[PDB]
């Protein structure tokens, strides 16, 4: 089994004990590492945030502690949009570019591989050839990372992608099959079903349906997202399953009705941290004071509300009931976005620390022995 965990280059902004420094990287927590993110700058692999090299190294300082464990970079991320991806991938020589580049760079930063996080081809602006084109990024990238191997007898870089769930996010960008043949993992991102763009309430990361869902909703569940990723092609044992250390939030229209599916009137207040509307890290839900939480009968999560603030999120229960059915369906690990969500200093949640991730990696048998 695999326990893959994203770093955020970002969440060593935060204030007080929502700060994530390197002191709170645990080097045998997960199995799998990845930075999050690298960008690009004329079509080469590059640094996003002024201290990425100290952080680099400090990535490094975790492989000497634990032997075992693999780091990855990713490139891109929702904030990145797709204009330099479109723009890499329009011509060979500009993929040839970035893949020679992003080869050097990760050698260079001693990176054990590469993860794709263009959110995404043929959708957030980017036009309709960019679904082969991904397809033939993605081959550029494996058949150079296998070339790479042969000539320098180097243990071959990785080639991970992050993915999204919604079918008309994954039919606009994704030829999985092709992909899936190329691809050592795939990082499902199964989480963002449902959010404060809505005008109801719906939880971010439901197991299975609500028996009021029908049509293209019925499918917007962790358990659709994953059987529709392996049908298209993916192995199981390549299908990694993501898991979020967050919830998302709604402003109700009335704190008198507080349904899944209620009526909302946008998103729910920041989070005194995460100071983002519409989503509140673990840290910022798991004992919120004179709130009333419950759990969604067929969807296996739960969610929480006060007044009328509405959260969706998951809990160790959820974590629990999520990795039971993924060794259920064979897949090869669990993911997790992201280290800085969960308390994983202990400061919260009076569970201890990284108290969801430990959840995953207890219930894939991971706990170094």
Same mark, same amino acid.
């Given at each position: 089994?695999?326990?893959?965990?994203?770093?955020?280059?970002?969440?060593?902004?935060?204030?007080?004990?929502?700060?994530?420094?390197?002191?709170?990287?645990?080097?045998?927590?997960?199995?799998? &590492?990845?930075?999050?993110?690298?960008?690009? *700058?004329?079509?080469?692999? +590059?640094?996003?945030?002024?201290?990425?090299?100290?952080?680099?190294?400090?990535?490094?300082?975790?492989?000497?502690?634990?032997?075992?464990?693999?780091?990855?970079?990713?490139?891109?991320?929702?904030?990145?949009?797709?204009?330099?991806?479109?723009?890499?991938?329009?011509?060979?020589?500009?993929?040839?570019?970035?893949?020679?580049?992003?080869?050097?760079?990760?050698?260079?930063?001693?990176?054990?591989?590469?993860?794709?996080?263009?959110?995404?081809?043929?959708?957030?602006?980017?036009?309709?050839?960019?679904?082969?084109?991904?397809?033939?990024?993605?081959?550029?990238?494996?058949?150079? !990372?296998?070339?790479?191997?042969? *000539? +320098?007898?180097?243990?071959?870089?990785?080639?991970?992608?992050?993915?999204?769930?919604?079918?008309?996010?994954?039919?606009?960008?994704?030829?999985?099959?092709?992909?899936?043949?190329?691809?050592?993992?795939?990082?499902?991102?199964? %989480?963002?079903?449902?959010?404060?763009?809505?005008?109801?309430?719906?939880?971010?990361?439901?197991?299975?349906?609500?028996?009021?869902?029908?049509?293209?909703?019925?499918?917007?569940?962790?358990?659709?997202?994953?059987?529709?990723?392996?049908?298209?092609?993916?192995?199981?044992?390549?299908?990694?399953?993501?898991?979020?250390?967050?919830?998302?939030?709604?402003?109700?229209?009335?704190?008198?009705?507080?349904?899944?599916?209620?009526?909302?009137?946008?998103?729910?207040?920041?989070?005194?941290?995460?100071?983002? =509307?519409?989503?509140?890290?673990?840290?910022?839900?798991? +004992?919120?004071?004179?709130? *009333?939480?419950?759990?969604?009968?067929?969807?296996?999560?739960? %969610?929480? !509300?006060?007044?009328?603030?509405?959260?969706?999120?998951?809990?160790?229960? +959820? !974590?629990?009931?999520?990795?039971?059915?993924?060794?259920?369906? =064979? &897949?090869?690990?669990?993911?997790?976005?992201?280290?800085?969500?969960?308390? !994983?200093?202990?400061?919260?949640?009076?569970?201890?620390?990284?108290?969801?991730?430990?959840?995953?990696?207890?219930?894939?048998?991971?706990?170094?022995?």
């Amino acid at each position: 089994a695999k326990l893959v965990c994203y770093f955020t280059n970002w969440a060593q902004y935060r204030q007080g004990e929502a700060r994530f420094l390197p002191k709170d990287l645990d080097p045998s927590l997960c199995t799998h &590492l990845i930075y999050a993110f690298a960008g690009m *700058t004329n079509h080469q692999l +590059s640094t996003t945030e002024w201290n990425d090299e100290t952080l680099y190294q400090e990535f490094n300082g975790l492989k000497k502690m634990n032997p075992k464990l693999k780091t990855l970079l990713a490139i891109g991320g929702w904030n990145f949009g797709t204009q330099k991806f479109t723009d890499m991938v329009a011509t060979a020589n500009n993929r040839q570019t970035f893949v020679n580049s992003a080869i050097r760079f990760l050698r260079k930063y001693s990176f054990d591989g590469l993860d794709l996080d263009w959110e995404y081809p043929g959708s957030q602006g980017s036009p309709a050839v960019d679904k082969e084109r991904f397809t033939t990024l993605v081959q550029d990238l494996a058949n150079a !990372f296998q070339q790479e191997a042969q *000539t +320098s007898g180097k243990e071959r870089l990785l080639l991970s992608a992050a993915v999204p769930a919604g079918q008309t996010y994954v039919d606009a960008g994704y030829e999985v099959d092709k992909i899936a043949q190329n691809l050592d993992f795939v990082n499902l991102m199964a %989480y963002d079903f449902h959010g404060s763009w809505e005008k109801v309430t719906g939880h971010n990361s439901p197991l299975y349906k609500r028996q009021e869902e029908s049509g293209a909703a019925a499918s917007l569940n962790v358990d659709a997202a994953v059987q529709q990723w392996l049908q298209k092609g993916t192995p199981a044992s390549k299908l990694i399953l993501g898991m979020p250390t967050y919830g998302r939030s709604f402003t109700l229209a009335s704190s008198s009705d507080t349904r899944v599916g209620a009526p909302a009137t946008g998103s729910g207040t920041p989070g005194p941290f995460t100071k983002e =509307g519409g989503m509140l890290a673990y840290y910022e839900v798991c +004992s919120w004071k004179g709130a *009333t939480k419950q759990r969604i009968q067929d969807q296996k999560v739960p %969610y929480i !509300f006060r007044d009328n603030q509405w959260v969706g999120f998951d809990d160790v229960e +959820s !974590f629990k009931t999520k990795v039971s059915y993924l060794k259920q369906k =064979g &897949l090869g690990g669990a993911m997790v976005w992201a280290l800085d969500l969960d308390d !994983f200093a202990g400061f919260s949640c009076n569970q201890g620390r990284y108290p969801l991730i430990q959840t995953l990696r207890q219930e894939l048998s991971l706990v170094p022995r």
